[PDB]
Design a protein around this ligand. Structure first.
Ligand SMILES: CC(=O)O[C@H]1C(=O)[C@@]2(C)[C@H]([C@H](OC(=O)c3ccccc3)[C@]3(O)C[C@H](OC(=O)[C@H](O)[C@@H](NC(=O)c4ccccc4)c4ccccc4)C(C)=C1C3(C)C)[C@]1(OC(C)=O)CO[C@@H]1C[C@@H]2O
Ligand SMILES: Nc1nc2c(ncn2[C@@H]2O[C@H](COP(=O)(O)OP(=O)(O)OP(=O)(O)O)[C@@H](O)[C@H]2O)c(=O)[nH]1
Ligand SMILES: Nc1nc2c(ncn2[C@@H]2O[C@H](COP(=O)(O)OP(=O)(O)O)[C@@H](O)[C@H]2O)c(=O)[nH]1
Ligand SMILES: [Mg+2]
Lengths: 440, 432
């Protein structure tokens, strides 16, 4: 049996989890109340796959999720919403105030207490699983909860389980727009968490998804629902191999092996090709070559970083739907022929290929059109260093005068931790610089 | 759960609190008798933030009413919502301070402070998880200023962890109603900057200007001013009571708005303001809300923000809207007005959004500014203070109640340290 445990910390994590579980329930034909009419309709087969949903004796399927957030409001919206009957009542809510965009509150003082109960529920779930594959945690840099409690949870999970894979999906601060003034402090303080304990961390920028929604989907006024739906599609594309049969199945272990050349460079970018509206779905073939070329466009990247300013270290293409290996090989050859896409000399192969027969599903009331084919490209490249350097600059401009520091140090945190985190992030940058220089 | 204990001191504080409770009861659908007659289910989702549930399905506000003159208390009781309050919370005495801060803080208030603190302790201990206190009063007055400062100091000693807020009405350049306003204002500002976490500065001149120019009211009264202050009060705490795409607590606002401990004085504002008979011409949208937000004439503190720099601002929007639009609008406001924001705090604009607008508006929003220009107010008060302390204009009335020139001198020195602190980040050019 193959399965993963999904964790959602913070408001962004909980909302992304709502989108993800909506998509999963629609994919597997599970009703919001947990009953699957397909069981009585068919009388056989396997529809409620054990990757995400656990079956009970009464025919009710319950997801393998642990929603956590110090704010009662965000999870209370779920507990009284449409999916109130889906999740287990144990929803891990701290009946107190929030981290207040403070890493120290979410890591030292208030982030504790609930941590033991959260680890207890995670332990219960892990005992429930057989052949557990890994953890998929959803958080967001810049938030107090998503920084501090994520640090605590990742640390304790590393101590307890250790060997299991740990995938992170996070919203990195944007170059320009943000909804808090202390985002650089939390983001730079989360570097130890995202570098020591996480085995593979994916980062998405809100401005990139806004531009994608505006240009491709022709949505002039997007909101967080569309961003969460796109992230849900990305995670579904990642995890579709563990569920549905395919010609080339990509397990999480082999997925991680071919995307992390070295231990401390596990920060790949993500992109989704067939992002197109219903009106523009016509007039375009959407063949394999078109989507494969569309993956590498700088315009379609999910993070504000130009790939042409660095080098492509490794790449993994996961196809879904009516895709044949011949077209994938032809597209990869065409991409290798192109010269604007530069690959490091020490990786002659470069590309990993996976194919799945199940095509993508369309959420009701959504924006993505129905497409026979789809692909997700997950690429480890050195351009991400630039995306880290901009934020680094902001931190210095806020740390020269010790602005907003008294709030952090009044919750048990030491002043020098800022400088230590800065030197750490400085290191990761130098390493992404060193790994580029070609050999001689 | 996060619930707030409300305290009202002085005549102005009592009036503003009465209007504020009227606004809150209308928002939550609470009848004047205390029963619930709302329509939406979200009204009772977080009613315990501001109310306590009684036996007969009634709701009593968690208010504490304080004064040294029974007249204001009788005025509140003989009113539309007089019966809503708990009678035991009407703490009052006789022989008010009479516009004398020394009487309010040392002589008369020192006796009623024990009863007020007893009621505060009883109310706070019944909470599940207290969040903080909010106090409404006027600094230029008598019993209000003195007993408010005394209560703030005592509660801060009692409950150091919880957040403290204050909605302070301060003197004005032109609109003067008492002769000893500078003395009370100086001592109140000393106590406030010592022992508070947030302090929203309100001015009668700015509210009158908003009424005359924006709302086109021919005959504004204190009711309209209390209405505006109540709208701001509800906007500040909207996020605790209703769900939103991006929540924001009072603690989060305090963390994001206070760069250094002594800079916790704020300029409030509210949008939209339409004047009636012009709503049909105006198109309501997020750009219009933002444009009215950052206009100089919409501020309630009687400060021109263009005479300084914005240390940090926070916008809380209410109503269904797109996050891309609001983020873009804040970015354009920052970029176009590049010279009015400090260059060492990139993106000094906090954003919060809630999905439950006011009852009669499709969209609304509130603004909290922290800018250097506020220094002007303090400077003005200091000038007037000097103009009376050089000759000891009215000093003896204070010194008869157990005061000394040293206390006034240190209060003035602390205000000068405050204005110097604010002035430090006004001039441009500095650093890498
Ligand atoms: C044509 C129309 O839609 O009617 C509006 C209206 O005409 C205008 C001019 C209203 C009107 O407000 C005023 O005339 C006014 C006068 C002095 C001070 C403040 C307001 C209105 O009275 C105010 C009233 O507002 C509300 O109901 C809000 O929910 C408001 N409620 C109260 O203040 C309130 C009143 C009585 C009892 C309890 C509460 C509110 C705002 C923020 C937070 C909580 C509540 C509304 C819809 C209107 C009228 C009736 C004309 C305005 O008020 C607000 C803040 O809604 C003034 O500019 C705005 C925008 C509106 O267009
Ligand atoms: N894409 C997307 N981002 C979100 C969403 N909700 C919140 N965010 C991001 O989260 C950041 C701050 O909120 P969070 O990180 O979730 O903070 P929190 O989890 O509420 O924890 P506290 O700070 O203690 O309240 C912002 O910069 C947002 O960009 C969402 O629904 N979609
Ligand atoms: N906005 C507003 N201000 C008021 C009101 N009543 C009094 N004030 C202000 O309060 C000041 C007088 O202070 P006062 O309340 O008499 O002090 P107290 O006797 O200690 O309560 C004056 O400058 C008025 O401008 C009111 O109803 N609304
Ligand atoms: Mg939160």
């Amino acid at each position: 049996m193959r399965e993963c445990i999904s964790i959602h910390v913070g408001q962004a994590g909980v909302q992304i989890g709502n989108a993800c579980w909506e998509l999963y329930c629609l994919e597997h034909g599970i009703q919001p109340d947990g009953q699957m009419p397909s069981d009585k309709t068919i009388g056989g087969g396997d529809d409620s796959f054990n990757t995400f949903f656990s079956e009970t004796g009464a025919g009710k399927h319950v997801p393998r999720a642990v929603f956590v957030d110090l704010e009662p409001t965000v999870i209370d919206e779920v507990r009284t919403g449409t999916y109130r009957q889906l999740f287990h009542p144990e929803q891990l809510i701290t009946g107190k105030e929030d981290a207040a965009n403070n890493y120290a509150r979410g890591h030292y003082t208030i982030g504790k207490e609930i941590i033991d109960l959260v680890l207890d529920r995670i332990r219960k779930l892990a005992d429930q699983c057989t052949g557990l594959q890994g953890f998929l945690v959803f958080h967001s840099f810049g938030g107090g909860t998503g920084s501090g409690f994520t640090s605590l949870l990742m640390e304790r999970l590393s101590v307890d389980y250790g060997k299991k894979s740990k995938l992170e999906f996070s919203i990195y601060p944007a170059p320009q727009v943000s909804t808090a003034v202390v985002e650089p402090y939390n983001s730079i303080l989360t570097t130890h968490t995202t570098l020591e304990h996480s085995d593979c961390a994916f980062m998405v920028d809100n401005e990139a998804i806004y531009d994608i929604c505006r240009r491709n989907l022709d949505i002039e006024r997007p909101t967080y629902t569309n961003l969460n739906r796109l992230i849900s599609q990305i995670v579904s594309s990642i995890t579709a191999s563990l569920r549905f049969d395919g010609a080339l199945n990509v397990d999480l272990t082999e997925f991680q092996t071919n995307l992390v050349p070295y231990p401390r460079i596990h920060f790949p970018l993500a992109t989704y090709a067939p992002v197109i509206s219903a009106e523009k779905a016509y007039h375009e073939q959407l063949s394999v070559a078109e989507i494969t070329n569309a993956c590498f466009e700088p315009a379609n990247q999910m993070v504000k970083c130009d790939p042409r300013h660095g080098k492509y270290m490794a790449c993994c293409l996961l196809y879904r739907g009516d895709v044949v290996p011949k077209d994938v090989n032809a597209a990869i050859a065409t991409i290798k022929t192109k010269r604007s896409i530069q690959f490091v000399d020490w990786c002659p192969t470069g590309f990993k290929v996976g194919i799945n027969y199940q095509p993508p599903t369309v959420v009701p009331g959504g924006d993505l059109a129905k497409v026979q084919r789809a692909v997700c490209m997950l690429s480890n490249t050195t351009a991400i260093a630039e995306a880290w350097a901009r934020l680094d600059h902001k931190f210095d401009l806020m740390y020269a005068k010790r602005a907003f520091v008294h709030w952090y140090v009044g919750e048990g945190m030491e002043e020098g931790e800022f400088s230590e985190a800065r030197e750490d992030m400085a290191a990761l940058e130098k390493d992404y610089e060193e790994v580029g220089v070609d050999s001689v | 759960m996060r619930e707030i204990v409300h305290i009202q001191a002085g005549q102005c504080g009592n009036q503003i609190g009465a209007k504020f409770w009227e606004v809150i009861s209308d928002e939550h659908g609470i009848d004047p008798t205390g029963s619930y007659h709302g329509d939406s289910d979200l009204q009772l989702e977080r009613i315990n933030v501001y109310y306590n549930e009684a036996t007969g399905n009634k709701y009593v506000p968690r208010a504490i009413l304080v004064d040294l003159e029974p007249g204001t208390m009788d005025s509140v009781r003989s009113g539309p919502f007089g019966q809503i309050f708990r009678p035991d919370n009407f703490v009052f005495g006789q022989s008010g301070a009479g516009n004398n801060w020394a009487k309010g803080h040392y002589t008369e208030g020192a006796e009623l402070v024990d009863s007020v603190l007893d009621v505060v302790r009883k109310e706070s201990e019944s909470c599940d998880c207290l969040q903080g206190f909010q106090l409404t009063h006027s600094l230029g007055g008598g019993t209000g200023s003195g007993m408010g400062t005394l209560l703030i100091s005592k509660i801060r000693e009692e409950y150091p962890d919880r957040i403290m807020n204050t909605f302070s009405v301060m003197p004005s350049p032109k609109v003067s109603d008492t002769v000893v306003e500078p003395y009370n204002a100086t001592l109140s500002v000393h106590q406030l900057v010592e022992n508070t976490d947030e302090t929203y500065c309100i001015d009668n001149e700015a509210l009158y200007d908003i009424c005359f120019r924006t709302l086109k009211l021919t005959t504004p009264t204190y009711g309209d001013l209390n209405h505006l202050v109540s709208a701001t009060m509800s906007g500040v705490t909207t996020c605790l009571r209703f769900p939103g795409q991006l929540n924001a607590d009072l603690r989060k606002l305090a963390v994001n708005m206070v760069p250094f401990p002594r800079l916790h004085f704020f300029m409030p504002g509210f949008a939209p303001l339409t004047s009636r008979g012009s709503q049909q011409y105006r198109a309501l949208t997020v750009p219009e809300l933002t444009q009215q937000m950052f206009d100089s004439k919409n501020m309630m503190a009687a400060c021109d923000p263009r005479h300084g720099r914005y240390l940090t601002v926070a916008a809380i929007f209410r109503g269904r809207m797109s996050m891309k639009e609001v983020d873009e609008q804040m970015l354009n406001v920052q970029n176009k007005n590049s010279s009015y924001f400090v260059e060492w705090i990139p993106n000094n604009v906090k954003t919060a959004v809630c999905d439950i607008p006011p009852r009669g508006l499709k969209m609304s929003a509130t603004f909290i500014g922290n800018s250097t220009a506020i220094q002007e107010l303090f400077k003005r008060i200091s000038e007037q203070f000097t103009a009376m302390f050089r000759r000891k204009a009215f000093l003896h009335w204070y010194t008869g109640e157990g005061m000394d020139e040293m206390e006034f001198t240190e209060a003035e020195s602390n205000m000068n340290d405050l204005v110097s602190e604010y002035q430090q980040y006004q001039d441009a050019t500095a650093d890498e």
